[PDB]
Amino acid sequence: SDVPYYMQILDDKGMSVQTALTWAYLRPYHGRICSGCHYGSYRGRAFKNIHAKALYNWWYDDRSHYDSPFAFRYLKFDNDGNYKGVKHGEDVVGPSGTTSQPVEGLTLDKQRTVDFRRDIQPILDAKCAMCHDSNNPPNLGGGLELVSVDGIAAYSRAYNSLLEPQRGKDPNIGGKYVNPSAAINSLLVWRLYEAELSANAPREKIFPIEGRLLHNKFLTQDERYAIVEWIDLGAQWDNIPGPDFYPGYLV
Amino acid sequence: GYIQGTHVKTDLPGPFHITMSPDGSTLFISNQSGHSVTFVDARTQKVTGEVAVRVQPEASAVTPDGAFLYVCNAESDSVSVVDIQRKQEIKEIKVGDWPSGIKISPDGKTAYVACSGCMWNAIDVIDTGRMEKVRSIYTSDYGPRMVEISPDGKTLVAILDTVGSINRSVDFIDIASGRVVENRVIHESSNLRDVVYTPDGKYIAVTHQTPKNWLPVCEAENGQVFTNNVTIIETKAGGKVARLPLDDLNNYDGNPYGMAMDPKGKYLYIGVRGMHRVTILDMDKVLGLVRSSTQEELDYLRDDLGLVRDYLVARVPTGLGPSSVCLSPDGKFCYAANYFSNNVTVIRTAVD
Ligand code: HEC
Ligand code: HEC
Ligand SMILES: [Ca+2]
Ligand SMILES: [Ca+2]
Ligand SMILES: [Cl-]
Ligand SMILES: [Mg+2]
């Protein structure tokens, strides 16, 4: 509470179908209800009468403030890569008995994010850069070495490649390989899962009929979903606030 | 001297071509109206002599050691051999019609001469030891303008500029074999003035124009009649042929002619004869565009009149009629030969 946040509804592969773009905040001990996902219950429409299963998971105990579960750190998937469930992290916790559920995700120090330099780039170096060089776009090689563009060196070759715009496409939607805050709309993810994930096609020619190579088995589930999370988060580069030890802009 | 195709005399040299010694100390200018070749010292930028050759030289090539200069005399239908140190022509070898260009093999043992006569298809080979014309390699069509030899020296490309043809092509020759392996057509092209190789030998650049012949002649806007283009061809088997624009919407490069390739393949230099300027392009952005685009997308991008600004480094003011350009071996200087102004423009490149 007392921190800015928003939400994303997810499908059975763990990808965001719709993102709520705004900043929501809860006061301490407060709780907030909404009929739907931008349904208009908080804008122009009356609350729809709905008998929900979640209502009984909220507060059922008189010795507690709230009996609702805290946000889980990780996910569990099956062998198919489909959603199995939710998974507890290391941050679990005076404390008193004022809630039934385990206390998770209240430590700001330990809150997890996906950083391109720390997380994604090593995966790219290990499983990708071998077959992707200047002669085979996108160019994922070069490691974390910064690339100067118009007199400014910020990011690496792989980041510059993956975030590249596409002709005839609104960059607010996405680029060639990446759609920020939609992984399901991203060509990169389309190829990593080797399937058509959404009803919005990134381009006209997606899967080559000649010389095609299946990319779905190159990564484990953790790596691939790390990329998914990275894209859904807005596909940043430096996700650690303030100057850090990881490669970046310096003068 | 005489103005080309005329009996009218002029005192002006009229430089048609330029090249440089592999050690970069000397420039050799072929004077079309002067019937001679001007020697210039690179460091002092001073004329160190003028060597008389046969009628109307349009081209010259230097031996790897730099002891000899092979000049193409177009009207004389011949090739002069010049001693560089003696500043004297020691022989005249006779070739097919209008040699428009000549180049020496990497080993320096062979010279290749493109015979550009409109009804002539030939590339004449010349042994440097015999100083004589061995045989002729017949191209796929008429009018080879210029040749170029690959860095590995096992392949020879020839631009065929063929009169009365909308589709003008490029021939690939196997030097050891001495025959045509493949012919690649540049669709809707005319006036191919040059061909160059990339240092890695994976691409060739060809300057030309795109006419719209099947359309009424009505306006000058949006390149309704002529557009000016540079084409990058991938030397691999089944490689892409990418026709790319040289023009802005309201600014066009008239009649692109001469080309100079950066030694490391960083930049491309294009003499623009009609617009009297040197167009410098970024070759990694160009080749980057070629690698990342399909054939369809490139074919659509040929008519994009805003596309140049992506890969365009500069357009540099020159004298009148810069028909030819050349580079120093370090690539820090570009020289452009100006016919009407009778001079050479010296340009400091982006390389540092
Ligand atoms: C060699 C075995 C490769 C490895 C390792 C990786 N990729 Fe690849 N990729 C390879 C080829 C031969 C091709 C050609 C086109 C095709 O679909 O087969 C590709 C293509 C891609 C693409 C599509 C590019 C486009 O259509 O514009 C993407 C997005 C891509 N590759 C990404 C990618 C990633 C993320 C990799 C690490 C898991 C990776 N590639 C490895 C060959 C090889
Ligand atoms: C699906 C994702 C959800 C859910 C679960 C909630 N909201 Fe709402 N929300 C959503 C969208 C797509 C948008 C607009 C995004 C955009 O315009 O780019 C919003 C917006 C808001 C706002 C801003 C004002 C407005 O647009 O009306 C507020 C405030 C807001 N949402 C509040 C809110 C509340 C109280 C919810 C109940 C838990 C809630 N959101 C859930 C989509 C989604
Ligand atoms: Ca930081
Ligand atoms: Ca003749
Ligand atoms: Cl709602
Ligand atoms: Mg008009």
Quick structural summary:
Chain A has 251 residues and is largely without helices or strands.
Describe, in plain words, how this protein is organized in 3D.
The structure is cut from a larger assembly and holds chains A (251 residues) and B (352 residues). In chain A, strand 5 (148-149) and strand 6 (152-153) form a beta hairpin. In chain A, the strands form 3 sheets. A two-stranded antiparallel sheet of chain A has the order 1-2. Chain A has a two-stranded antiparallel sheet with strand order 3-4. A two-stranded antiparallel sheet of chain A has the order 5-6. Chain A has a domain at 115-232. Chain A has 251 residues and is largely without helices or strands. Chain A has 4 helices and 6 strands, in the order E-E-E-E-H-E-E-H-H-H. In chain A, helix 1 (116-127) packs across helix 4. Chain B has 3 helices and 27 strands. Chain B is globular and about 55 Å long. In chain B, strand 22 (267-272) and strand 23 form a beta hairpin. Chain B has a single domain, classed as Methylamine Dehydrogenase, Chain H (7 Propeller), CATH 2.130.10.10. Chain B is mainly beta. In chain B, the strands form 7 sheets. In chain B, strands 1-2-3-4 form a 4-stranded antiparallel beta sheet, with no helix packed on it. The longest helix of chain B is centred in the last third of the chain and has 9 residues, at 283-291. Chains A and B meet through loops of A and loops of B. One calcium ion is lined by residues 77, 97-98, 117 of chain B. One calcium ion (CA) binds at residues 238, 240-244 of chain A.
Strand content of chain B: over 45%
* Rg over C-alpha atoms of chain B, rounded to the nearest angstrom: 19 Å
Number of helices of chain B: 3
Radius of gyration of chain A: 21 Å
Order of helices and strands of chain A: EEEEHEEHHH
Cα-to-Cα separation, first versus last residue of chain B: 41 Å
* Share of residues in helices of chain A: 10-25%
The main β sheet of chain B shows up as:
4 strands, antiparallel
Q: What's the number of helices of chain A?
A: 4
Tally of strands of chain A: 6
Tell me the structural class of chain B. Answer: mainly beta
Query: Numbering strands along the chain, what is their spatial order in the largest sheet of chain A?
Result: 1-2
Shape of chain A: globular
Q: Span from first to last CA of chain A?
A: 38 Å
The second-level CATH architecture of chain B is 7 Propeller
* Fraction in beta strands of chain A: 5-15%
Name the chain pair with the biggest interface and residue counts per chain.
A-B, 5 and 4 residues
Subcellular location (chain B): Anammoxosome
Organism (chain B): Kuenenia stuttgartiensis
GO cellular component, one term (chain B): anammoxosome
InterPro entries (chain B): Host-pathogen_enzymatic-act, N2O_reductase_N, WD40/YVTN_repeat-like_dom_sf, YNCE-like_beta-prop, YVTN_b-propeller_repeat
